[PDB]
Design an enzyme around this catalytic site. Sequence first.
Site, short mmCIF file in Angstrom:
data_model
loop_
_atom_site.label_atom_id
_atom_site.label_comp_id
_atom_site.label_asym_id
_atom_site.label_seq_id
_atom_site.Cartn_x
_atom_site.Cartn_y
_atom_site.Cartn_z
N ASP A 155 0.95 5.33 1.49
CA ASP A 155 0.56 6.28 2.27
C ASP A 155 0.81 7.76 2.24
O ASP A 155 2.10 7.96 2.07
CB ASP A 155 0.65 5.89 4.05
CG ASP A 155 0.61 4.29 4.00
OD1 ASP A 155 -0.55 4.16 4.15
OD2 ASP A 155 1.37 3.62 4.37
N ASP A 208 0.71 -1.36 0.15
CA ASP A 208 -0.05 -0.06 0.14
C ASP A 208 0.88 1.23 0.04
O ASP A 208 2.09 1.14 0.30
CB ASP A 208 -0.74 -0.11 1.19
CG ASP A 208 -0.19 -0.13 2.51
OD1 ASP A 208 0.36 -1.26 2.75
OD2 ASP A 208 -0.04 0.94 3.26
N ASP A 265 -3.88 5.24 1.11
CA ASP A 265 -4.41 5.69 2.25
C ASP A 265 -3.81 7.57 2.24
O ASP A 265 -2.81 7.78 1.93
CB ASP A 265 -3.90 5.42 3.44
CG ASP A 265 -4.35 4.21 3.87
OD1 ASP A 265 -5.34 3.42 3.32
OD2 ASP A 265 -3.68 3.16 4.78
#
Length: 326
Positions: free
Chosen positions: A196, A194, A250
Amino acid sequence: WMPAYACQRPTPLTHHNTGLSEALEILAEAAGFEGSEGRLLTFCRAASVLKALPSPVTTLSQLQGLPHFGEHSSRVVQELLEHGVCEEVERVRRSERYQTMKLFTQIFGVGVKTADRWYREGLRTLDDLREQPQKLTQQQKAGLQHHQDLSTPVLRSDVDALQQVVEEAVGQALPGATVTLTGGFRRGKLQGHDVDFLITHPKEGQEAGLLPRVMCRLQDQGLILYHQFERSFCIFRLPQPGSWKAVRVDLVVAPVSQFPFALLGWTGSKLFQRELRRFSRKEKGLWLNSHGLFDPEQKTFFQAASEEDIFRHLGLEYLPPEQRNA
DNA sequence: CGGCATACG
DNA sequence: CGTAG
DNA sequence: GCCG
Ligand SMILES: [Cl-]
Ligand SMILES: [Mn+2]
Ligand SMILES: [Mn+2]
Ligand SMILES: [Mn+2]
Ligand SMILES: [Mn+2]
Ligand SMILES: [Mn+2]
Ligand SMILES: [Mn+2]
Ligand SMILES: [Mn+2]
Ligand code: NA
């Protein structure tokens, strides 16, 4: 010699006890799947101690005195040193319960409680879950549809491209706002699962209302495969040679007053932040989160202009992000 | 023995 | 319940 | 599971 809290010692991303730490982390994960959060924490802490050591553990005597090593974790290490495998670890690894809980909890939108309920219902595979889709939340549907791409490592090249598109939308949403890469990539990881980002603006209060404006602009550029405020948990369309792949991103907003606390929290690692908050409260009597640091006796918040300030307030030697890989 | 981090969506 | 570090 |  070795401090008891992970925030009191440097922990690099790569180290000298990788196999031992990985074995203890299997036991930690399995404890979490059974709801045993205390055992999870001990196994995680023990693994992290080994990551912080300056050389390989070769003999059991080297554990005496190390924090978080008692009878259980010491036996695990002993078996790995003597035989190259720990029977308990291998039993966990091959177990249907561990394998299925790992599979289900790694779906975006599925936690331990949902995974356990599905397990007790007899479900075992992703196709089992796809066969009864009206029993899924929208988030779980997106997590399952994108599961294959989301299991594929994100590379640094991917991160740089995503940061450019986020900056473009952030610039139209609010000129002067900034975008900072956080999470594991800020700790030096070359890959991840992921990406961020932390967004702020230098003028306190100008960041209010920013995240909806950013999301709408990314959505109108066709880049958002899934979204659901201050925190957005998205799935983005990332270009690839002749196609594209889904990537978890995110996006977080903080006012500049809170930015050092948010940067610290979102940079992690998870264990580092839990240990830092535990240290703050239990050793210093101060309450820490990703918004601020509160003195509950004077009923005042500490001002911080940098991560360096926060470590100083807590009486800890500064650790750069790449030494926070607890 | 109690504690185990502490938030937002 | 999920999500984050 | 370990610590204080
Ligand atoms: Cl927070
Ligand atoms: Mn035991
Ligand atoms: Mn033996
Ligand atoms: Mn991350
Ligand atoms: Mn807030
Ligand atoms: Mn993330
Ligand atoms: Mn007890
Ligand atoms: Mn116990
Ligand atoms: Na999950």
